[PDB]
């Protein structure tokens, strides 16, 4: 289900990178997010978020701290 | 049922995981050879969080014994209480990690981690809902700090719903004999912003300080400070494993303390500290033990609290306490001590109450306190490695074995970035 | 006469039960194994017992309690403490971990596991009441299965049963005195459900009752047990008309619908009154008259707030023992003339009152004096909506740089629902000030 949400917001704005951030999935709920298997959460509204730290963020803000072509 | 599952890393975790079975087993009456001898079932009761039930009625710790060097695993295996975990779980290398962080993360620890990984899912099995792992290492080199943290890469991406406590012993300026503390201490922060739920910062400087002007002691042993963080481990993790008239838990403590998922660095400090003879001019009392807490002198890391902020605090105590007592003593020390806390969070304090005390005391409290005093501890530790890293001295040691300049430049962005995001708070 | 189940939920539910219990079985006379012995009964029967347990096993008696927990450790106590042998096994629900002081686990990541199992349980024992009365709630706002899980629960009841009653006995956060950081996420996320899936809620806080254990019982370290007392006494005079004969009784519903003057002013703060110090009591002569008044000092209210700065909407006042009705209504009339007492102009009467014949029994421990004659206050008054403002306003200072909401989000909770808390909070503010208003 949630896959093609994950899918959405990673490329609506698009990845301007010369190798294209990785956003690819092994199965549901593991996805290799710039080669690192997190793990994604959403229930209502489309609210994504990931299991990262010391608690959560959403999956949007955490792209905004990871991929070099999101800070400009 | 809510078991915990021990890992060490390292000589300093090797060491103080050493001294916290050691404490674990006398509060459960534990025979150095595996059986009960106590006189209380409560201690039954939840002896399955830190322990596995074997034929003839024998216990096992459920922790694991790791480093890329096999001198410790000898020495706490032939040592005291060495006989009592199951001869599988101690998974060591031939090699070492010689200081360097490469070594740990990428040409050693790497060919020592699926060792460990199939050792910690045999053990994630065998409990019937563990909810997090304890690792206990150093700061200092590769062996705790670059493979004891390649490790909890690893579990996190497996286990990511569970909780991952650090009891990470950062190094210190005035204490070190090692000279690429700077480099390792600075790749492991790296990650340790990423891949755990709580982090517990140590330095031996503070818990030396500790034994010299609070227990007396002129010549404090490495088995002494291990003792002082044993007793911070066991009184952390102490409400799961008795009844008390308040509970906290680990997932507990960190809703209540980690405000922003970046910020769960955490300073402990441990309140019935007394030197054996002037232990009988004081009061066993809640006041003495809320008011140390707070000392600038008792915290087990350098940083004073009295240069930053308090953002949260939880204090665990443990005894035949009264909830009246310790809310008017929470709330004595905030307002006074007022300009010490946050403005924007109005109740910073958590309280748990425990009703089994540490053996031979009436009352104990284990402090945490999140505050915006660690970051200047992280100041120091980047300004001595910018300082090393300008001139690239002892680089080759570790570029010739998988880093590029730029993870190091990245390291020190990330770590100048928690500092920034540390000092926010004000 | 008729029947009710009490549902305790997490640690402060389920502690304040095993008090209660323990004074609703000595005050019936039933032994910590359940039996009961033969007494005299001159008539046949004794139905004063059956409004809270079950007659099953020719002489042994099983109460009408559900207790349920996210957490283990509170309810294995119970099964192994004086009163293990009461309460069926079945009954004592249990989940694998606890919400850990989160709302948006209680509610829906974790609480959702465990609302199949209570629901068919308390449909178990309804279906054994010949006559439901109602639901007595035993929980507390600032923890996260107490806040989410009996939030989640009161929402079922009311679509499985929908006009039963539904008392709410809530543990409110006390001003200052707080024991967790995050109390104020889960105090405001109860208060929608609360508003609008109970019909009386009777908030009480910790401070509160610490001072009534200091300046009327004189006791210099009070624990939970003695506060978890009070709150058993309080829970026992409300339903005392229920289980035994009066001069003037009042059922459950007429009570309700003679105190709630709207449907949502549904929050009456609590009192009990001759609560004081064992040796002290052989100084006061404890007649009807001093035990009304004691009821109106703001000392003596189960909440922080003090009545002065608001108007009641209606009081009752559940006498019980050798009270009788003459000085009642001297009582009243007392109060009524005597000024500082303000009860808004709408209202002439402004009291239910109800007698019983039964004194309160107290419970071996020494924290009560045996008294012949007792009242609990209970009173709806505008004054309450300042314990709500203090407490939305440390909300508002937290959540206005979302300083813990990622625990909340993270558990599946959009962050618009404490926006719609918040307001609806404060849309409760409106409501209770504009009742102030004499028209
Ligand atoms: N508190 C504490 N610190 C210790 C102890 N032993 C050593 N340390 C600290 O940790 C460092 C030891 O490095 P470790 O990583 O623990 O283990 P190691 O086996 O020496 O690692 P390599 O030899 O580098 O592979 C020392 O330099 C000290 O800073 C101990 O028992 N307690
Ligand atoms: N009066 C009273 N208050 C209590 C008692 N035990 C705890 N509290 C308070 O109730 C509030 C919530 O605590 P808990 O009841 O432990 O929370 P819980 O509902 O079990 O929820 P979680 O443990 O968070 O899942 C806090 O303010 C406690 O101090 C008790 O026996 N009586
Ligand atoms: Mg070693
Ligand atoms: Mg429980
Ligand atoms: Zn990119």
Same mark, same amino acid.
């Not at chain 1, 080669?35 to 959560?56: C, P, Q, S, T, Y």
């Not at chain 2, 517990?200 to 002007?213: G, K, P, S, T």
């Not at chain 2, 999140?370 to 002892?394: C, D, G, P, Y």
């Given at each position: ?72 | ?137 150093? &700061?200092?080199?590769? $062996?705790? +700090? /670059?493979?004891? %943290?390649? @490790? ?9 719903? #569970? ?64 003792? &002082?963080?044993?007793? $911070?481990? +066991? /009184?952390?993790? %102490?409400? @799961? ?9 680990? #997932? ?175 | ?439």
């Amino acid at each position: 289900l949630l896959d093609d949400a994950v899918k959405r917001i990673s490329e609506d704005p698009p990845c301007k990178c010369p190798t294209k951030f990785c956003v690819e999935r092994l199965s549901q709920g593991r996805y290799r997010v710039g080669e690192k298997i997190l793990f994604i959460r959403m229930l209502h509204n489309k609210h994504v978020m990931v299991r990262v730290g010391g608690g959560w963020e959403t999956f949007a803000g955490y792209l905004l701290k990871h991929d070099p072509c999101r800070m400009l | 049922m809510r078991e915990i599952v021990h890992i060490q890393a390292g000589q300093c975790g090797n060491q103080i995981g050493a001294k916290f079975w050691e404490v674990i087993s006398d509060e459960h009456g534990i025979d150095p050879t595996g059986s009960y001898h106590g006189d209380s079932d409560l201690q039954l009761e939840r002896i399955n969080v830190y322990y596995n039930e074997a034929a003839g009625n024998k216990y096992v710790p459920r922790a694991i014994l790791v480093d890329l060097e096999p001198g410790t695993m000898d020495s706490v295996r032939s040592g005291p209480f060495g006989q009592i975990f199951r001869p599988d779980n101690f998974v060591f290398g031939q090699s070492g990690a010689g200081n360097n962080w490469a070594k740990g993360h990428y040409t050693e620890g790497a060919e020592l981690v699926d060792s460990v990984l199939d050792v910690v899912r045999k053990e994630s099995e065998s409990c019937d809902c563990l909810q997090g792992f304890q690792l206990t290492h150093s &700061l200092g080199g590769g $062996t705790g +700090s /670059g493979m004891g %943290t390649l @490790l909890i890469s690893k579990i996190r991406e497996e286990y990511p719903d #569970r909780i991952m406590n650090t009891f990470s012993v950062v190094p210190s300026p005035k204490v070190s004999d090692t000279v690429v503390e700077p480099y390792n201490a600075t790749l492991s922060v790296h990650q340790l912003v990423e891949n755990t739920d709580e982090t517990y910062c140590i330095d031996n400087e503070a818990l030396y300080d500790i034994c010299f002007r609070t227990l007396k002691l002129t010549t404090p042993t490495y088995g002494d400070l291990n003792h &002082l963080v044993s007793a $911070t481990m +066991s /009184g952390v993790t %102490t409400c @799961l494993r008795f009844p008390g008239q308040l509970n906290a838990d680990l #997932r507990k403590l960190a809703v209540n303390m980690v405000p922003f998922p970046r910020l769960h660095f955490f300073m402990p400090g441990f309140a019935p500290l007394t030197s054996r003879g002037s232990q009988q001019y004081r009061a066993l009392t809640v006041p003495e033990l809320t008011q140390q807490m707070f000392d600038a002198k008792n915290m087990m890391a350098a940083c004073d609290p009295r240069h930053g902020r308090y953002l949260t605090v939880a204090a665990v105590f443990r005894g035949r306490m009264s909830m009246k007592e310790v809310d008017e003593q929470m709330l004595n020390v905030q307002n006074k001590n007022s300009s010490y806390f946050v403005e924007w969070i109005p109740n910073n304090v958590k309280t748990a109450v425990c009703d089994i005390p540490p053996r031979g005391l009436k009352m104990s409290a284990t402090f945490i306190g999140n505050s915006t005093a660690i970051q200047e501890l992280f100041k120091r530790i980047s300004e001595q490695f910018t300082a090393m890293f300008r001139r690239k001295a002892f680089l080759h040691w570790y570029t010739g074995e998988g880093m590029d300049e730029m993870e190091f430049t990245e390291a020190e962005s990330n770590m100048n970035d928690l500092v920034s995001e540390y000092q926010q708070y004000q | 006469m008729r029947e009710c189940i009490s549902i305790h939920v997490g640690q402060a539910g389920v502690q304040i039960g095993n008090a209660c219990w323990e004074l609703y079985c000595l005050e019936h006379g039933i032994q910590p194994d359940g039996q009961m012995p033969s007494d005299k009964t001159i008539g046949g029967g004794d139905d004063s017992f059956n409004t809270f347990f079950s007659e099953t096993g020719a002489g042994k008696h099983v109460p009408r309690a559900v207790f349920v927990d996210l957490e283990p450790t509170v309810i294995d106590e119970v099964r192994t403490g004086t009163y293990r042998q009461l309460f069926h096994p079945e009954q004592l629900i249990t989940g694998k971990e606890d919400a850990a002081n989160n709302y948006a686990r209680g509610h829906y990541t974790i609480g959702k596991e465990i609302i199949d199992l209570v629901l068919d349980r308390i449909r178990k024992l309804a279906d054994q009441c010949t006559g439901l009365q109602g639901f007595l709630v035993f929980h507390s706002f600032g923890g996260g299965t107490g806040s989410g899980f009996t939030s989640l629960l009161m929402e079922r009841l009311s679509v499985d049963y929908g006009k039963k009653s539904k008392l709410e006995f809530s543990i409110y956060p006390a001003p200052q005195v707080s024991t967790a950081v995050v109390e104020p996420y889960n105090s405001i996320l109860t208060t929608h459900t609360t508003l609008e899936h109970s019909d009386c809620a009777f908030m009480v806080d910790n401070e509160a009752i610490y001072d009534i254990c200091r300046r009327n019982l004189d006791i210099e370290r009070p624990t939970y047990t003695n506060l978890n007392r009070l709150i058993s006494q309080i829970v026992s005079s409300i339903t005392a008309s229920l289980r035994f004969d009066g001069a003037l009784n009042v059922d459950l519903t007429e009570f309700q619908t003679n105190l709630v003057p709207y449907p949502r002013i549904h929050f009456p703060l609590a009192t009990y009154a001759p609560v004081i110090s064992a040796e002290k009591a052989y100084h006061e002569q404890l007649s009807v008259a001093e035990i009304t008044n004691a009821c109106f000092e703001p000392a003596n209210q189960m909440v922080k707030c003090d009545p002065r700065h608001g108007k009641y909407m209606a009081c009752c006042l559940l006498y019980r023992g050798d009270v009788v009705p003459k000085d009642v209504n001297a009582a009243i009339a007392t109060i009524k003339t005597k000024r500082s007492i303000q009860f808004v102009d709408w209202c002439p009467t402004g009291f239910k009152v109800g007698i019983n014949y039964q004194p309160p029994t107290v419970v071996p421990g020494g924290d009560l004096a045996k008294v012949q004659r007792a009242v609990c206050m209970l009173s709806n008054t505008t004054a309450i909506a300042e314990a709500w403002a203090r407490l939305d306003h440390k909300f508002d200072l937290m959540y206005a740089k979302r300083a813990f909401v990622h625990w909340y989000v993270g558990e599946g909770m959009e962050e618009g629902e404490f926006s719609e808390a918040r307001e609806d909070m404060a849309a409760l503010e409106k409501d209770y000030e504009e009742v102030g208003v004499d028209s």
